[PDB]
């Protein structure tokens, strides 16, 4: 309600202080109210407008809010959807075997069993608890189900209530883990150093009576990169990454490691590869003069414990019968029908399985084709639903660890010194054999117009 | 390369961009999906080239065919070769004197890059008499709390005024601890345990069901915590904005770190915060409902680590060369020259290399150094790889041990209604007992939802 929702802001390019159909300019106070969020949605040196001649700058300008004018405007809806589900801080589960990472999440009474149970209960699912308790989400048994788990109330002994024997089950299945490359952190560097294995030197001469410029002196060469990694546990066998990425750089050791996408993290533990590389400068040597040029070749290796975060997602399927005269299905059946509905807890898939969608579009009558979330609100009130939904939708991440080590060869910049006279050709010796013995193959120096 | 910071959303109709801009295509959109989605509303839908669309974070940034009257665009003629943001240059924590010494003497990560910056900008003799190259045979001397990197001047040299070595002064250091870089070791202690269950009843002595009253639980909790600081640098680190101590395990901690205070002067204590749980139950006519409130105790400890970003001022003193320098006026009188940069978060245009470089193509902006001249003198590549080194983020590890104990209540739970043999409450609370277990000023109240 009252509070401004960052994720509902929309930008317009309609001129100063102008908004599109059914949007109004965001004012200073509101902007300040969620400063971090607006800035995080802006470009480096972006500058957008706010109400009554004010402006908010991007991260580059330190997201500052001051008087000003902008052609574009941060606008808010004249009819904003109220009572958003908050997004709680991530629940970080330490690295372990898939089974253990999953037990830790699934049997957590306060962060999983109770919220998901209460969600099912709020949706009108009957008997969401075991007969050892009168409260929902208690005396809940967690049992293995393939690569998933099932959560149903213990059914030992007898129970009171019509069909109390038919306990609703909460199926947690279809798990997935997406390693986030940006979450990269590393411990103390075990090994680290970069030797100067050789330095190529010589000169670059200018013969003509006119200043030689606009030519690129380019060094091309090959070297091998040897890296390897370990995986402390087995969850590794199931994590992938949306897209390929370059292993992050640490120290002064230039590496060229490409982790491949959608390929088991546990299946990519290292490799030896020779990579063609290059370096180049565009000198400007004055008439009939020469410049000293130097290229330092290096060798570096580094080792360290590493850690990434994998975003966990799973399917939440609720199955049981819908309570009589207390139901949230849109048709509000009264025949206590056996029911099955699955929510995708993680990356969006479709409307039917998106709690956040059905919640946010709850006031658009034509969109409610599944759970009538409005019912949960008259039944429980805004705060209770918001707090509960936030708990079931809380992001879950799993740590991914192990040791990393690598060694590679590479050249530094082609450096040049103060030009010397005399009274664009190169005189830079390249000992093929010594270089080859050092691990630098197919090394060449070329001159080519800019 | 599609540079995300040059992207621009326009609201001018189907596939329409602003002047000198063009529609982002499906592929280009995929190459920078996260940056685009990170600028979009939860359920925003925006257009791309040839009738495609990219959706907001809520739809998981799906890229698919669709019609949209607002569009993601890119310059037809983009400012090319933006300075690459390299990975962080980690520095071994220690006492302030250590981190500075380690930074300042780093030949390949600081001396060479800052010396080349001066040289490319036209500063003369940025090198020692014992080398023909820029940035070699340099001497670093103190000058208060600031440092000075300048070519060795001993012996004899050649060149007009070769005795005038350009000095690179580093001063005014500052270290900003980044709360999001949080990480921890083995959580050498943990768990939660139930220490008491406060139970009672809500009764309804009416012939009609009751749903108009909030039962709320209010109380004070004290978190007894602490944290050590392995090294001395922490005496100078601060945080721009306050933050909640990060949640680890399942011990709810109510700890806050204040901005503008030395990291080292916030090592723990007993902090009291007032919490409040509530619920609006529905009690059938002539009925009562059991109310349950569990109270927990929790202990946690573990080594911790946050990184502190290091910023400093880089001042270049020397005279600008004869045949060309970078100053927008391009003097030739071979003048002494003082100019300082701010290596770290923005401050102002004059002292921001990133700013002058990114806006180089805008004539009115070049009021200091024009980096278009340096690019025509050394090539586009040379210059962005050099500025990539100069602006390479530098950070020191801030480590130590963290320990904490706290008491917290679970949510208020409601049982099944059972026929009695404004909503009313009957739940005993013994101030002294509760207090013995770390819960003070505990109250259960029944309030109409209409207040």
Report on the structure:
Chain A: Residues 323-332 are annotated as: Interaction with glycans from host GPI-anchor. Chain A: Disulfide bonds join 19-75, 159-164. Chain A: The record marks 351, 367 as: Important for heptamerization. Chain A: Residues 45-61 are annotated as: Interaction with host N-linked glycan. Chain A: Its main location: secreted. 2 copies of one chain form a homodimer. In chain A, a hairpin with a 7-residue loop joins strand 4 (54-57) and strand 5. Chain A is elongated, with a radius of gyration of 31 Å. Helix content of chain A is 15%, strand content 38%. In chain A, the strands form 5 sheets. In chain A, strands 7, 8, 9, 10, 11, 13, 14, 17, 19, 20, 21, 22, 23 and 24 form a 14-stranded mixed beta sheet that branches. A 3-stranded antiparallel beta sheet of chain A has the order 1-6-2, with no helix packed on it. Chain A has a 3-stranded antiparallel beta sheet with strand order 3-4-5. By secondary structure, chain A is mainly β. Chain A has 3 domains: 1-90, Aerolysin/Pertussis toxin (APT), N-terminal domain (Pertussis Toxin, Chain B, domain 1); 91-176 and 311-397, Proaerolysin, chain A, domain 2 (Proaerolysin, Chain A, domain 2, 2-Layer Sandwich); 177-310 and 398-450, Beta Complex (Proaerolysin, Chain A, domain 3). Chains A and B meet through strand 1, strand 19, helix 5 and strand 22 of A and strand 1, helix 5, helix 7 and strand 20 of B.
């Amino acid at each position: 309600a009252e509070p401004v929702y960052p994720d509902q802001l929309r930008l317009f390019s309609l001129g100063q202080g102008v908004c599109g159909d059914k949007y109004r300019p965001v004012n200073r106070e509101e902007a300040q109210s969620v400063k971090s969020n607006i800035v995080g949605m802006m470009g480096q040196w972006q500058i957008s407008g706010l109400a009554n001649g004010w402006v908010i700058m991007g991260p580059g300008y330190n997201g500052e809010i001051k008087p000003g004018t902008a052609s574009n405007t941060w606008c808010y809806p004249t009819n904003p959807v109220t009572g958003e589900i908050p997004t709680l801080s991530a629940l970080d589960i330490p690295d372990g075997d898939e089974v253990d990472v999953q037990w830790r999440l699934v049997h957590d009474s306060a962060n999983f069993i109770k919220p998901t149970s209460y969600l099912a209960h709020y949706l009108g699912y009957a008997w969401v608890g075991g007969n050892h308790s009168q409260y929902v989400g208690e005396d809940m048994d967690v049992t293995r189900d393939g690569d998933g788990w099932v959560i149903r109330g213990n059914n030992d002994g007898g129970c009171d209530g019509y069909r109390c024997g038919d306990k609703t089950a909460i199926k947690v299945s279809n798990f997935a883990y997406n390693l986030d490359p940006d979450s990269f952190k590393h411990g103390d560097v075990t090994q680290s150093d970069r030797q100067l294995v050789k330095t190529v030197v010589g000169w670059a001469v200018n013969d003509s009576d006119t200043p030689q410029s606009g030519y690129d002196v380019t060094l091309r060469y090959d070297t091998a990169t040897n890296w390897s990694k370990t995986n402390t546990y087995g969850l590794s066998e199931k994590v992938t990454t949306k897209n390929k990425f370059k292993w992050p750089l640490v120290g002064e050791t230039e590496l060229s490691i490409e982790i491949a996408a959608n390929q088991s993290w546990a299946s990519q533990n290292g490799g030896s590869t020779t990579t063609s590389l290059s370096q180049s400068v565009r000198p400007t040597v004055p008439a009939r003069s020469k410049i000293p040029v130097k290229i330092e070749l290096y060798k570096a290796d580094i080792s360290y414990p590493y850690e990434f975060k994998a975003d966990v997602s799973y399917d939440l399927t609720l199955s049981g019968f819908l309570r009589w005269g207390g139901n949230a299905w849109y048709t509000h059946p009264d025949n206590r029908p056996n029911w099955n509905h699955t929510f995708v807890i993680g990356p969006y898939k479709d409307k039917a399985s998106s709690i956040r969608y059905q919640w946010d579009k709850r006031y658009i009558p034509g969109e409610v084709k599944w759970w009538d979330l409005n019912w949960t609100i008259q039944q429980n009130g805004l705060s209770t639903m918001q707090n509960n939904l936030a708990r079931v939708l809380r992001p879950v991440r799993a740590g991914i660890t192990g040791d990393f080590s690598a060694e590679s060869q590479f050249a530094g910049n082609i450096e040049i010194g103060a030009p010397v006279p005399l009274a664009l050709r190169l005189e830079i010796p390249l000992d093929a054999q010594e270089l080859s013995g050092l691990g630098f193959n197919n090394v060449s120096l070329s001159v080519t117009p800019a």
